[PDB]
Amino acid sequence: QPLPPARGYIYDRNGVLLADNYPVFTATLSKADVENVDTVIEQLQPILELTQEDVDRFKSRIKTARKTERVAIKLNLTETNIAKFSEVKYKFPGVRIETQMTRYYPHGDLFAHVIGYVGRINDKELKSIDKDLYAGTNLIGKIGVEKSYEDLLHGTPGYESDPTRGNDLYLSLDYGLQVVASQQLAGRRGAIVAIDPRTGEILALVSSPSFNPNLFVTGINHKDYSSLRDNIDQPLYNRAVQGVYPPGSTIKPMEAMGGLHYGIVDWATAISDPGYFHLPGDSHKFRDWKKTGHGIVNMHKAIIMSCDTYFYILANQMGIDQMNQWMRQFGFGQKTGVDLPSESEGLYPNPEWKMRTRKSKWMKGETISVSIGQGAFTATPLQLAMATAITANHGSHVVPHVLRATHGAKPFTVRNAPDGKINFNGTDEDWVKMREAMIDVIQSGTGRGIRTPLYQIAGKTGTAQVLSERQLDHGLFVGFAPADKPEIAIAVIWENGRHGGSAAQLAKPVFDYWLLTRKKNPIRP
Ligand SMILES: [Zn+2]
Structure with a gap:
C-alpha cells in the first residue's frame, strides 16, 4: 500500500x-x-x-x-x-x-x-x-x-x-514589494525585476499581464486556456524570464566601465560631438539621438545626457570581441542561471554568432548598433537587473535566484552570496564615480521626475523600437538604492511606454516600498 x-x-x-x-x-x-x-x-x-x-x-x-x-x-x-x-x-x-x-x-x-x-x-x-x-x-x-x-x-x-x-x-520574493510592482504594471504590458545586489536574491518578479494559475491545477477547460493563449496581450508569456528587449541606453553605464577597464577612456577623456559618427570610408552616418550633439562630451556627460556619439567612438576602439568579453561579465548574452525554468539566453551579438546564424562576416557597422543597446542586442529584464546589481556592488557577480530557504527533511544547498569578482583594471573609485554619474541621471539628467527627498537613487533610462499603441517604443529603466549602500536594484520594461523617464516613474514606488514603507506599515494579505 x-x-x-x-x-x-x-x-x-x-x-x-x-x-x-x-x-x-x-x-x-x-x-x-x-x-x-x-x-x-x-x-x-x-x-x-x-x-x-x-x-x-x-x-x-x-x-x-x-x-x-x-x-x-x-x-x-x-x-x-x-x-x-x-x-x-x-x-x-x-x-x-x-x-x-x-x-x-x-x-x-x-x-x-x-x-x-x-x-x-x-x-x-x-x-x-x-x-x-x-x-x-x-x-x-x-x-x-x-x-x-x-x-x-x-x-x-x-x-x-x-x-x-x-x-x-x-x-526571496517579498509579498508587499510584489504587490507594489504589480500595481505599477496594472493594465500595462511589461516586466519589473528587483534583486538584492548583495546576494542575487530576487525580491520581486512581475510579468504583466498575469493569469490565475488555479485554473491549471485540476485541468483547464479548452475554452479558458484558448482565451489566455489567443489573447493579444499574451498573459501566459513570462516577459521577466523568457521575454527579451533591446536594452537601449540602459547598458551604457556598464559599457563605460568597460572603457575604463581596457584603458581606452578615463573620466576626463572628452570627444567633439557633431551629433553623428562615421566609420573610416563608410558613408552611413550613425546619428546621435540629438543630431546637434552634446558638444565636448566626457564619460560623466555621456551618462547624464545618454550621448550615443561617445559610445559609438568608444565601441569602435574597443571592438566587438572586447565588448563581448566585458559585457558578458554583467550577465548579458547567456542565461543568468535563475532557479526558474525556460530562462532566455538573450543575445550579445558576436562574429561566431553571425557566421552560424547569417553565414556572413561581421561588419564594423554592427558594432556601432550594439554600443547603444540596439542591433541584435536583446536582454531579459532578469539580465538587466543582474547587470545593475553588479554595477551597484562594484563588480561582485551574483546569480539571480528566488529560493531563500528550504525547511524539511531533504538535504539542499541554497546559494546566499556572490559567486565571484570581475578582475577590473580600474579602481573601486571608478564604480563610485559611475554611481555619482547615475545619481546625476536622476538629479539633473534623462531620468528627472522620479527624485526622492529621503534616499538617493542611481539610475539610467533607455527606449527600444518594436495598434497605434502596440507599435510605440518601449520605456526601460535600471537603477539601485540607497545608492551608497545598495539594498535593491530594479529593471523596468514598460512595453509601449514611449520614454524611459516613464519606466522610471514605475520604479519609485517599488524603491519607496522597500526602503521607507516595509519597516513601519508592511503590506500583508
Ligand atoms: Zn551626443
Whole structure:
C-alpha cells in the first residue's frame, strides 16, 4: 500500500503563504478492488461528467500501476458529481470517493509568473518518472518554482500493511514589494525585476499581464486556456524570464566601465560631438539621438545626457570581441542561471554568432548598433537587473535566484552570496564615480521626475523600437538604492511606454516600498 507524500508549502521571505494544499473529493479505483476495469470507466463516464482527456489518463496510469495503488478517475469532484455517483454508489464496489489534497495559490495572479502551477501527470511525464516515487501522486509541477523545485517540493512516499512531506520553500520574493510592482504594471504590458545586489536574491518578479494559475491545477477547460493563449496581450508569456528587449541606453553605464577597464577612456577623456559618427570610408552616418550633439562630451556627460556619439567612438576602439568579453561579465548574452525554468539566453551579438546564424562576416557597422543597446542586442529584464546589481556592488557577480530557504527533511544547498569578482583594471573609485554619474541621471539628467527627498537613487533610462499603441517604443529603466549602500536594484520594461523617464516613474514606488514603507506599515494579505 503506497501513501503518497503531502506537497511542501511555498512561503515568502516573511512567511506569507503563497502555495498550500486543501482537501477535495476524488473518485479512485484500485486494481485489487476492481475486475474488468475497462468496462467500469465507460459506465462512470456520464455519472462523473468525465471528458476523453480524464478517461485516457486513468487507463495510462492503471496499466503502469500496482494493486494497492489508488488511481484517480476524476479529481476535485463537483457537488453534482458526488450526488450522481452517490445515487449509484453500491452499483460500483471498490470505486471509492476519497479525501485527497489539491494545490491552491492564495494570491494566484500576483506570483503566477514565479511559482507557476502544478497540473495532472500526463503520459510523457509518466515515461520519465520513478513510478515507485510518484505512486499515487496525481499532481506534478508544470512551470515556475513548482517545476524547477518539483523534487524538493514532492516529498517521499511511505506505506501501511510512513510518508515524508515535501520540503517547504521560503522564496526571496517579498509579498508587499510584489504587490507594489504589480500595481505599477496594472493594465500595462511589461516586466519589473528587483534583486538584492548583495546576494542575487530576487525580491520581486512581475510579468504583466498575469493569469490565475488555479485554473491549471485540476485541468483547464479548452475554452479558458484558448482565451489566455489567443489573447493579444499574451498573459501566459513570462516577459521577466523568457521575454527579451533591446536594452537601449540602459547598458551604457556598464559599457563605460568597460572603457575604463581596457584603458581606452578615463573620466576626463572628452570627444567633439557633431551629433553623428562615421566609420573610416563608410558613408552611413550613425546619428546621435540629438543630431546637434552634446558638444565636448566626457564619460560623466555621456551618462547624464545618454550621448550615443561617445559610445559609438568608444565601441569602435574597443571592438566587438572586447565588448563581448566585458559585457558578458554583467550577465548579458547567456542565461543568468535563475532557479526558474525556460530562462532566455538573450543575445550579445558576436562574429561566431553571425557566421552560424547569417553565414556572413561581421561588419564594423554592427558594432556601432550594439554600443547603444540596439542591433541584435536583446536582454531579459532578469539580465538587466543582474547587470545593475553588479554595477551597484562594484563588480561582485551574483546569480539571480528566488529560493531563500528550504525547511524539511531533504538535504539542499541554497546559494546566499556572490559567486565571484570581475578582475577590473580600474579602481573601486571608478564604480563610485559611475554611481555619482547615475545619481546625476536622476538629479539633473534623462531620468528627472522620479527624485526622492529621503534616499538617493542611481539610475539610467533607455527606449527600444518594436495598434497605434502596440507599435510605440518601449520605456526601460535600471537603477539601485540607497545608492551608497545598495539594498535593491530594479529593471523596468514598460512595453509601449514611449520614454524611459516613464519606466522610471514605475520604479519609485517599488524603491519607496522597500526602503521607507516595509519597516513601519508592511503590506500583508
Ligand atoms: Zn551626443
